[PDB]
Amino acid sequence: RELKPQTCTICETTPVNAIDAEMHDLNCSYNICPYCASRLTSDGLARHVTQCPKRKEKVEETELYLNLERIPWVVRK
């Protein structure tokens, strides 16, 4: 584990770790869920990133950050 970083400056959903926190600064800047890529609005963003259930699944995956994946939105083909 690592020391918990600052709150997301875009959706206000507190990130657990640095990977989750950067990913957030990235998808919230485009109002897309960090976890389900729901393509929110700038006022749907805070309410949805606060309530998404895929958030918990991906973030329980970030507790096992030792794995290969970080941001499943950057790998494309």
Q: Report the interface residues with Zn ion, using CB under 5 A.
A: 8, 10-11, 24, 28, 33, 35-36, 38, 52
Least gap, CB of 74 to Zn ion (angstroms): 17
Residue 46 to residue 54: CA distance in whole angstroms: 15
Residue 75 to residue 60: CA distance in whole angstroms: 21
* The residue type at 13: T
Least gap, CB of 73 to Zn ion (angstroms): 12
> Tokens for 51?
């309530």
* 8/62 with CB nearer Zn ion: 8
Least gap, CB of 57 to Zn ion (angstroms): 10
